[PDB]
Amino acid sequence: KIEEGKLVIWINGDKGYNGLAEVGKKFEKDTGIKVTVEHPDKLEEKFPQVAATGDGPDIIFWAHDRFGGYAQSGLLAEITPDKAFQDKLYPFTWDAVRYNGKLIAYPIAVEALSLIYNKDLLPNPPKTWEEIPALDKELKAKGKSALMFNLQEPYFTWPLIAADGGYAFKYGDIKDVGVDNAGAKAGLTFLVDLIKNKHMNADTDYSIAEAAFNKGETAMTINGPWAWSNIDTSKVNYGVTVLPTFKGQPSKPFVGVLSAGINAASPNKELAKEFLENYLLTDEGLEAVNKDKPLGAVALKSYEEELAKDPRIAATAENAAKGEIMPNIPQMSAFWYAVRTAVINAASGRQTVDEALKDAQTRITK
């Protein structure tokens, strides 16, 4: 099964696995324990198959949303950091790793959508959604549009739909979803109106929105940190800020937390805890991973205050703190399917905000 006296770590190849490997050697030279870092493909799929037979890595890195399912099968060890350490990280990053009331992973990085704007076309971006319809009319007078973002994926529209009262699964509880409540309806209605008044096209997807923004056709777009590299090479003078409010309340973008779990079958749990708590989750450890490939916003308060010197990271973290934690539970799949259909049928008059959303509520509660 899992070897004793060492650490095998799994993380995705699109991360700073080389940087994490450096943090490992730093551990080796300090204990004599070899830390092997691997980045298998479909690792999010291989874990539940190797761990089930008592095998696999000691530590697995991945987005928090898949961890609920791992802990459901008892593949994850309940971690136990003391109050002192828990305080070194942002409180909300911890709610992302709580399952059935217990902590099942350490939060590493934070991710969330932000409002991106062309500083040349829009010196002062709108603080609210309600002021966007008007703004678009002004920009139309010059041949430019106000906003353009992916409308096909609920992941991009959820921020608005949930701004006022809207929410996925109630914190923990699965029989309590806020998809067809008054808030979600108000938000989706405002979204559909923008499409009806021609302020936005119902066929706008990711590629179209990105092209429009980079070619300088539209003033704003909603995207994540993974999109910045594209805009940089576009030269366009852009900025990243907090998302607009809707009816006085903040937009609720889903939050993704890159988490580090400990294999339940691992005989090196104490070592894993040592590595993660005193070697990785430190300003030096994270700065070694971030240098390889940026993590975005981090859960470690001390280091995050250092990364926030970037606008873009600071905006990411602000939007996240106000966001909603992606459904950690396994019932997540239904939600995405249900909401996606609703927004689409709602946008193309196939159904009304009431019908669409109501059908989505049942589909998820079943």
Q: What is the DSSP string of 291-315?
A: HHS---EESBHHHHHHHTTSHHHHH
The two structure tokens encoding residue 104: 């099942």
The answer to whether residues 205 and 150 touch, using CB atoms and an 8 Å cutoff, is yes
CB 252 within 8 A of CB 178: no
Helix ranges (H only) for the chain are: 17-31, 43-50, 67-72, 83-86, 91-95, 132-140, 154-161, 182-196, 206-214, 228-234, 269-275, 283-292, 301-307, 311-321, 332-347, 353-365
Instruction: Clarify whether residues 241 and 188 are in a common domain.
Output: yes
d(CA 103, CA 90): 14
> Which range marks the domain in which residue 155 is found?
112-255+328-366
Please report the sign of the dihedral spanned by the C-alpha atoms of residue 182, residue 187, residue 192, residue 193: positive
Closest CA to 259 of 19, 29, 77: 77
Same domain for 97 and 117: no
Report the interhelical angle of 353-365 vs 332-347 (nearest 10°).
170
DSSP letters spanning 32-61: S-EEEEE--TTHHHHHHHHGGGT-S-SEEE
Instruction: Say how many CA atoms lie within 13 Å of 342 toward its Cβ.
Output: 31
Q: Are residues 31 and 80 in the same domain?
A: yes
| SS3 state of residue 110 | strand
Is there a contact between 260 and 48 (Cβ–Cβ < 8 Å)?
A: no
As a dihedral over the C-alpha atoms of residue 164, residue 168, residue 171, residue 174, rounded to 10 degrees, the angle is: 140
Claim to verify: residue 141 and residue 60 sit in the same structural domain: no
Q: Is 33 exposed, middle or buried (0-12, 13-18, 19+ CB in 10 A)?
A: middle
According to DSSP, the residues that pair with 258 across neighbouring strands are: 63, 109
Strand (E) or helix (H) holding 153 = none
Token pair listed for 138: 């002004």
Q: CB within 8 A of 285, min separation 6: which ones? A: 23, 26, 279
| Alpha carbons 345 and 335: distance in angstroms, whole number | 16
The span from the CA of 149 to the CA of 56, in Å, is: 40
What letter would DSSP give residue 199?
S
The tokens describing 197, both together, are 């008044």
CA dihedral 71, 73, 75, 77 (to 10 degrees): 40
Per the CB < 8 A criterion, the answer to whether 91 and 83 are in contact is no
Q: What is the DSSP string of 121-140?
A: T-SS--SBSTTHHHHHHHHH
Centroid of chain to Cα 68: 15
Query: 70: closest CA among 263, 248, 240, 258?
Result: 263
Neighbour-count burial of 165, counting CB atoms closer than 10 A to its CB (0-12 exposed, 13-18 middle, 19+ buried): middle
What's the Cα-to-Cα distance from 109 to each of 16, 136, 326, rounded to whole Å? 12, 35, 14
- Residue 362 sits at φ, ψ, to 5 deg, of -65, -55
Same domain, 135 and 229: yes
Q: State both tokens at 84.
A: 């002192």
Mode of pairing for the β-strands spanning 59-63 and 254-262: antiparallel
Q: What are phi and psi of 238, to 5 degrees?
A: -110, 170
Which tokens is 268 given? 């090196």
Contact (CB, 8 A) for 168 and 155: no
Instruction: Locate breaks in the chain with C to N over 2.5 A; list the residue preceding each.
Output: none
Report the SS3 class of residue 73.
Answer: coil
Experiment type: X-ray
In a shared domain, residues 359 and 226: yes
CA distance 335 to 366: 11
Q: Are 153 and 146 in contact (CB under 8 A)?
A: no
For residues 257 and 252, give the distance between their C-alpha atoms in angstroms, rounded to a whole number.
15
What single-letter amino acid sits at 251? S
The token pair that represents 361 in the structure block: 């509520």
281 and 142 co-located in one domain: no
CATH of the domain at 295: 3.40.190.10
Half-sphere exposure of 352 (CA within 13 A, CB side): 2
Residue 274 burial (C-beta neighbours within 10 Å; 0-12, 13-18, 19+): middle
Q: CA 186, CA 168: separation in Å to the nearest integer?
A: 15
CB count within 10 Å of CB 198 equals 10
Residue with tokens 């003078």: 237
CA of 66: how far to CAs of 20, 37, 146, 236, 332, in Å? Answer: 21, 20, 36, 36, 9
Structure tokens that stand for 151 in this block:
């409308």
Q: Three-state DSSP class for 212?
A: helix
- Are 354 and 236 in a shared domain? yes
- Does residue 300 share a domain with residue 262? yes
Residue 363 CA neighbour count, 13 Å, CB half:
20
Q: CA-to-CA distance for 217 and 358, rounded, in angstroms?
A: 36
> Is 70 in the same domain as 126?
no
Pair 123, 201 in one domain: yes
CB 326 within 8 A of CB 66: no
Alpha-carbon gap, residue 78 to 88, rounded angstroms: 19
Q: How far apart are CA 241 and CA 47, in angstroms?
A: 37
Same domain, 90 and 177: no
- Name, in order, each residue with C-beta under 8 angstroms of 5's C-beta and a sequence gap of 6 or more: 33, 268
Handedness of CA 28, 33, 37, 43 (dihedral sign): negative
Cα first-last separation, the chain: 39
Cα–Cα separations (whole angstroms), residue 148 to 93, 127, 153, 338: 30, 16, 13, 23
Resolution value, angstrom units: 2.6
Structure-token pair, residue 215: 């070619």
Judge whether 278 and 26 are in contact, CB under 8 Å.
no
**Total tally of structural domains belonging to the chain:** 2
Contact (CB, 8 A) for 300 and 321: no
